[PDB]
Amino acid sequence: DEVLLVKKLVEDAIVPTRGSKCAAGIDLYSNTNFIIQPHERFLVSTGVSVQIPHQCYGRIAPRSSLALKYGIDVGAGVIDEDYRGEIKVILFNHSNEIFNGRKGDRIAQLIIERISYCRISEVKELNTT
Amino acid sequence: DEVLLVKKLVEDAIVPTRGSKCAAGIDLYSNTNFIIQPHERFLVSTGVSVQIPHQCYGRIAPRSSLALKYGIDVGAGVIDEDYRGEIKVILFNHSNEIFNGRKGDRIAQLIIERISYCRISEVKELNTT
Amino acid sequence: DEVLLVKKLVEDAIVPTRGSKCAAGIDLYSNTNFIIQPHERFLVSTGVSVQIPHQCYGRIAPRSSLALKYGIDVGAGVIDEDYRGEIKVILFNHSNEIFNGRKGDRIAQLIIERISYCRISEVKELNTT
C-alpha cells in the first residue's frame, strides 16, 4: 500500500488528481490567478502540501498542452519525501506572448518516481565500461 | 520480462534504439525535416507510438550534445503507460541561431522510469520531519 | 546495498552530498567560477565522475532556489550507469541578468532514479486503452 497524503493549506485549494487509470502524473492546480510576461517566469502556488510515499520523490513535470500551445515549461524539481512546505511550481514562459493563468487551472503534473537513497562513497578509481 | 512495444505509424519511421548496454535512454528519431527559429520551439514528430511496460512511464529527456552545441532543451513530459498516440517531442531552441533538424536525426531520449500509482488521500495534517 | 561511487578528477573537487535524510537529490558543486549572460547557457564542470548503482541512472535536476531567484534551469539529462566521464551540467539562464557562479557553489542536484532496461520490440498494433 502506497498513498500520497495531501493537506489543503487554504480552504479552496484543489487536491491533486490522477487523470486516467495509468496516468503517470497527478495534476497540480493553481490556487491563484497569475500573469507571466514573455520570456519571464512565475512561481505558482498550489495551496497544498504533501507527504510522498517512502523511497519515492515527487517530480514536477510540464503539461504537454501548455508547452505546445503556449511555450510553458516547468522546472523539473524535486519534492522530497521529507518536505512539508507548500508545493509551488516555477513556470517559464518561453513565448513572445503574455500567459494568463487562472485560479483552478491545471498548471503542471507531479510524478511519484521511485528512487534510491544509496550512500555515497569516494574512491580513487571507478570500474571500466 | 519487460518490453517496450513500438508501432511504426508511417513506413519510414525509425524504431527507437537503446545506444549502449546500460544506456538509461532510448534514442528518439525525427520523422521530418524541421527548422526552429532562435528562442522559439517546435513539436517534432517521431512517427511511432509505444506501449510502456507496467508501472513505468516514458520520460522525454534532452540529448546532451544538442543542449551543449545548439542550446536545445526538451520538455520533460510524460508518456503514460496507457497512451497510444504518436510520440511528439517539444524542442525549445534557447540559442540565437536557427536550428536545422533533419529526418532521421536523433532529437531526444525516452527513459523508462519506475513509478508509483499510489492513491491520493486528503488529510488535515501531515507528519513532522 | 546500493552505493554511488565518486571519483575526484581534480584534488579540490567536492564529493556530491545528500542534504537531508530523505533528500531525493544529491547536491552537485561547481569546480570553477563562471558567468552566464542573460538568455544564454554554460556547461559547468563538477570535477567528479561517478558509478551509478545498477538498474538506475542519475538525473540532473535544477536547484529550486536558483530557479526562483535567478531564473536558472538545468537540462534534465541522463548520467548512464556505464558513464565514466566527468559530470558536467548545462545551466540555462532564462533571466535578463548576468548569473555569477562561484567555485564550490551548489549548482544542480543528481537524483538516482530507478529505471527499466526493457527490450524494445516492433509490432504492427498496440493494445487499446
User: Which of these, A110, A111, A112, A108, lies nearest to A42 by C-alpha position?
Assistant: A108
List Cβ neighbours of C1 (8 Å cut-off, separation of 6 or more).
none
In terms of phi and psi (left: phi > 0; alpha: psi -120 to 50; beta: otherwise), the region of A47 is left
* DSSP string over A43-99: EEE-SEEEEPPTTEEEEEE--HHHHHHH-EEE---EE-TT--SPPEEEEEE-SSS-E
How far does Cα B59 stand from its chain's mean position? 6
Q: How many helices (H) and strands (E) does chain B have?
A: 1, 13
Q: Write the CA distances from C78 to A2, B13, B74, B89, C53, integer angstroms.
A: 27, 25, 13, 17, 14
User: Which of these, C62, C63, C49, C61, lies nearest to C16 by C-alpha position?
Assistant: C49
Q: Torsion angle of alpha carbons B60, B65, B70, B72, nearest 10°?
A: 10
List Cβ neighbours of A19 (8 Å cut-off, separation of 6 or more).
A25, A26, A27
Set of chain B residues whose Cβ sits within 8 Å of the Cβ of C73: 73
* DSSP string over chain C: --EEEEEESSTTPPPPEE-STT-SEEEEE-SS-EEE-TT-EEEEE-SEEEEPPTTEEEEEE--HHHHHHH-EEE---EE-TT--SPPEEEEEE-SSS-EEE-TT-EEEEEEEEEB---EEEE-S-PPP-
DSSP B81: T
CB B80 within 8 A of CB B52: yes
CB B90 within 8 A of CB C37: no
Report residue C78: phi and psi, to 5°.
-145, 120
Q: How far is C80 from B78, CA to CA, in rounded Å? A: 20
- Grid coordinates representing B128 are 513532522
Resolution (A): 1.3
CB C43 within 8 A of CB B68: yes
Mutate to test the interface with A, among C5, C28, C84, C97 (most CBs of A within 10 A): C5
Report residue C92: phi and psi, to 5°.
-100, 130
CB B73 within 8 A of CB A92: no
Mutate to test the interface with A, among C22, C79, C111 (most CBs of A within 10 A): C22
User: Which of these, A73, A42, A25, lies nearest to B90 by C-alpha position?
Assistant: A73
CATH number for region A1-129:
2.70.40.10
Buried b (16+ CB within 10 A) or exposed e, C18-35: beeebbbbbbbbbbeebe
Closest-CA distance, C13 to chain B, in angstroms, reads 22
Q: Does B61 reach chain C within 8 Å, measured CB to CB?
A: yes
Q: What's the first-to-final CA gap in chain A, in angstroms?
A: 38
Technique used to solve these coordinates? X-ray
Is B74 exposed, middle or buried (CB count within 10 Å of its CB: 0-12, 13-18, 19+)?
A: buried
